[PDB]
Design a protein around this ligand. Structure first.
Ligand SMILES: O=C(O)c1nccn1C1CCC1
Ligand SMILES: [Zn+2]
Ligand SMILES: [Zn+2]
Ligand SMILES: [Zn+2]
Length: 231
């Protein structure tokens, strides 16, 4: 089964193989008095690995690299952070020191610098307008518009029909909004509609935090965001 928040100690990282050459990575972090799970993605790219998002902190991200070496044994050569918050760029310095080329959109890099978060080194061009898509090796990167943050990207793995929604997509067990301080609530449903229209074939949808599902996670997130909008 998919590992849940209460069975991962803070500091440990679990890997979940979704398909040949596609994994999620799952870590936990304590925030504001609670413990949260957090997901990212690993995609095999020939003899190398592409990493999507850190494991939420330098300590977790070091453990992430250790678990990848243990369970996969291929080198992580590039990493993409899907927005500027610490569950996505926290650990970029660890990755850079290990020889990983770290990437984010110019928007994410700008917002990380303002916030004082770690800044991925390389820039992802071609993603500044809502609906923009670019290929990045074995994945497609998609900017759906502002949602959880103004810079959030989603990631699609065509070989496996895996859609990583990042923090713009909520797991089912989350029925209230949570951290929307940086969100565009007015645009978030429209941005989710763009995801649906661009990846209607997705079979395996991974939220930023918690259990994967199908495309029903998009409807779920829209429902939850609209309820927050109305209260
Ligand atoms: O909503 C998120 O994407 C997130 N990431 C880290 C922490 N959070 C919030 C705060 C309650 C869940
Ligand atoms: Zn965030
Ligand atoms: Zn998050
Ligand atoms: Zn729901």
């Amino acid at each position: 089964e998919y590992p849940t928040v209460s069975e991962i100690p803070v500091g440990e990282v679990r890997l979940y193989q979704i398909a040949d050459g596609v994994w999620s990575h799952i870590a936990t972090q304590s925030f504001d008095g609670a413990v949260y799970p957090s997901n990212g993605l690993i995609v095999r790219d020939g003899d190398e690995l592409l990493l999507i998002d850190t494991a939420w902190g330098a300590k977790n991200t070091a453990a992430l690299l250790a678990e990848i070496e243990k369970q996969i044994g291929l080198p992580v050569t590039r990493a993409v952070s899907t927005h500027f918050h610490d569950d996505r760029v926290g650990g970029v310095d660890v990755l850079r020191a290990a020889g990983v080329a770290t990437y984010a959109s110019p928007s994410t890099r700008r917002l990380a610098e303002v916030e004082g978060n770690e800044i991925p080194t390389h820039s992802l061009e071609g993603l500044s307008s809502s609906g923009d898509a670019v290929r990045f090796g074995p994945v497609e990167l998609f900017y759906p518009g502002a949602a959880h943050s103004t810079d959030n990207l989603v990631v699609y793995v065509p070989s496996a029909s895996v859609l990583y929604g990042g923090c713009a997509i909520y797991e089912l067990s989350r029925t209230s909004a949570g951290n929307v301080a940086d969100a565009d609530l007015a645009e978030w449903p429209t941005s989710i509609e763009r995801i649906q229209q661009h990846y209607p074939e997705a079979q395996f949808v991974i939220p930023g935090h918690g259990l994967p599902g199908g495309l029903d996670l998009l409807k779920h997130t829209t429902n939850v965001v609209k309820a927050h909008t109305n209260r």
